[PDB]
Ligand binder design. Structure first.
Ligand SMILES: *[C@@H]1O[C@H](CO)[C@@H](O)[C@H](O)[C@H]1NC(C)=O
Ligand SMILES: CN(C)C(=N)NCCC[C@H](N)C(=O)O
Length: 246
């Protein structure tokens, strides 16, 4: 399990939480010095629990699939909540079993569905540590529209930050003031699966991508990633989705 407390939080404590989250995801192999997430895990060991506390000390526990860093659901007091998708229903067999009641959210966890339910794309949703405090507070008592937006914040400030150093740093900049995600942030989120695949395929293609990945850099400019000597690979990406899950 990993924990994060918004009360007294600063860029340093958030970084320690993201480090903890990365370290809780198992791997047997690194590919170009980046941990390779496992193809599969059986039973309850497939799920990591994150304990998040809002500024007031109230808490949710979030269940994360350790093979892909996908949030499956969360526990708020005695009620569990899960995404409307097969992987999450499976997860509900193993975590939060002692909840008095289980609600299936009226959407899956994919970004496009969540944005529809929330009423806005995440280009327009401010993120940061104050937004995460708000998200935790929202998820404490059920409200499916509010929850969709809260979940978009939660996913980007936990899972996406775990995957990319740049995104972690973006959230650190927003420790005390929310701001919509940078164009590079959205680009990286969208490209994780693509990048994970091309990095694994580069193991037998001399570090060369079979298919180049187009990204936006720290300044809105549309660039092509063609090999493992790229910044994105050497410095930024921190976890690889196993190609067996792509
Ligand atoms: C590989 O990527 C580097 C760094 O982005 C770039 O400068 C170079 O042009 C690329 N080289 C090849 C052979 O793809
Ligand atoms: C990290 N996440 C949540 C995202 N970037 N989107 C990936 C797909 C979501 C998945 N269905 C889920 O269960 O979370």
């Amino acid at each position: 399990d990993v924990s994060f407390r918004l009360s007294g939080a600063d860029p340093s404590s958030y970084g320690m939480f993201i480090k903890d989250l990365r370290n809780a995801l198992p791997h047997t192999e690194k590919v170009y010095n980046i941990p390779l997430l496992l193809p599969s895990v059986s039973g309850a060991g497939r799920y990591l629990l994150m304990h998040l506390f809002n500024y007031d000390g109230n808490t949710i526990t979030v269940a994360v699939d350790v093979t892909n860093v996908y949030i499956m659901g969360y526990l708020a007091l005695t009620t569990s909540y899960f995404f409307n998708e097969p992987a999450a229903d499976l997860a509900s067999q193993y975590v939060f079993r002692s909840a008095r009641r289980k609600i299936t959210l009226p959407y899956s966890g994919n970004y496009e569905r969540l944005q529809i339910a929330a009423g806005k794309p995440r280009e327009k949703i401010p993120i940061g540590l104050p937004a995460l405090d708000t998200a935790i507070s929202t998820l404490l008592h059920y409200d499916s529209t509010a929850a969709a937006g809260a979940l978009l914040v939660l996913i980007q400030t936990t899972a996406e930050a775990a995957r990319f150093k740049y995104i972690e740093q973006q959230i650190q900049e927003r420790a005390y003031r929310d701001e919509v995600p940078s164009s590079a942030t959205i680009s990286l989120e969208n490209s994780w699966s693509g990048l994970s695949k091309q990095i694994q395929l580069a193991q037998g293609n001399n570090g060369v991508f079979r298919t180049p990945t187009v990204l936006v850099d720290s300044k809105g400019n549309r660039v092509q990633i063609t090999n493992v000597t790229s910044n994105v690979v050497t410095s930024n990406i921190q976890l690889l989705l196993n190609t067996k899950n792509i």
